[PDB]
Amino acid sequence: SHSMKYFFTSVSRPGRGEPRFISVGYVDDTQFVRFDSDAASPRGEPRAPWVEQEGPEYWDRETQKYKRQAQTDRVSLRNLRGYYNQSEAGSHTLQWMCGCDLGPDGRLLRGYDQYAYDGKDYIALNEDLRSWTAADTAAQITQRKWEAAREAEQRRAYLEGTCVEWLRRYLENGKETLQRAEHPKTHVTHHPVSDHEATLRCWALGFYPAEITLTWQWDGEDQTQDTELVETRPAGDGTFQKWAAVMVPSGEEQRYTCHVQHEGLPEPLTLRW
Amino acid sequence: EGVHRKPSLLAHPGPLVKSEETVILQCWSDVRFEHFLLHREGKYKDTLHLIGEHHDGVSKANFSIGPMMQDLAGTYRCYGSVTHSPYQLSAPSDPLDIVITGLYEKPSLSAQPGPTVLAGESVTLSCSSRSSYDMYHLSREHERRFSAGPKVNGTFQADFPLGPATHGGTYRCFGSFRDSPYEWSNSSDPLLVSVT
């Protein structure tokens, strides 16, 4: 399912000036835009080739939207201090996540529009794109203001229209990378743990859609237990890494197999040491 | 009274400022102040400075509060400076509340015993919405406020008795939430009261 997701973070820093505001946008697992209030002469910046040619009007109004949202967050943080009866001495964090899921038939599958304050759910637009869920009585004030402002109707038109239409455009202009899965390069390494045992580590490197499954099998049977697995991690170039390891009695190495499942492989891969 | 007496402060075209529009806050005095300071107190305190302008009769400074945003709403006082470097300020002007409007849906505004009334008859104006505004504001063509009447048939409403009808006027109504008293809804549909 393709998706476009935006993430906004504002952190107040009492005494150290105005809040730090940071926003990033993704199509699937590809960052494509960034805005940081601490950069010199901050503006929206491209981070993927397929928005670099959107033109100066596109980039100017995104930049102005970011700058207005940074100041809107400053009022929001001040309101939140009031709602929770907090002093002006503490640092506080407002996070906003907003985005789109398409699915195979490529119109809106699911919208997202939701907030956290100091790491806790605050308010969320419901799956119906017309009503809100407030997490506590402070967020009930925000809910009451947003019902009076008819905010849900603006979020909804963004999620069903703008968000879907521009995601489709980004998928087309960037189809050469967003829609061409980059397959993992795989190998198994072998690290003796003793004389009676060794660690088999199955490696997947440089794969782009971050979703992947590595399963060690013994005579075809899934080795659920006894398999250490790391969190998928960014390689730093847009691709991802992951390994899965298993402790085997030395001598029986070759009845172990690694099963790799990934969108960039026509068939899943079976490999051995 | 001395040169430290307070100047005056007004909003052009008025103190109720629609979102993203501009207002001019003018300070003026017959005192030939060389500078003026405009101070907004409260949650977003700020201070602006303008050299004084001297025309016949009045010494003024015209502060433009532009792209109306919520951080610009609040109470404004202003000061004249008898001096140039370190400021030697006059008494503060009377405070002036500058509100941003247009942030929420308009309330309804109606005349209880009819809007066209005979002279002498008492008349009640009522501000009602189904948004849960805390406070309602009634303005004849600017600031009169009453608290909301909590969930009755689900509407929140506040009633303004106008007393026995002398002159009449055109009335508008705005709703507001307790924690941000300078941030108002859209104007209700204006109601013309005729006292015949």
Binding site: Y6, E62, K65, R68, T72, K145, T162, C163 | Q70
Partner: peptide, 9 residues
């Protein structure tokens, strides 16, 4: 495209 500018909380 950014989700525009939302109302304050």
């Amino acid at each position: 495209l950014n989700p525009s500018v939302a109302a304050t909380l």
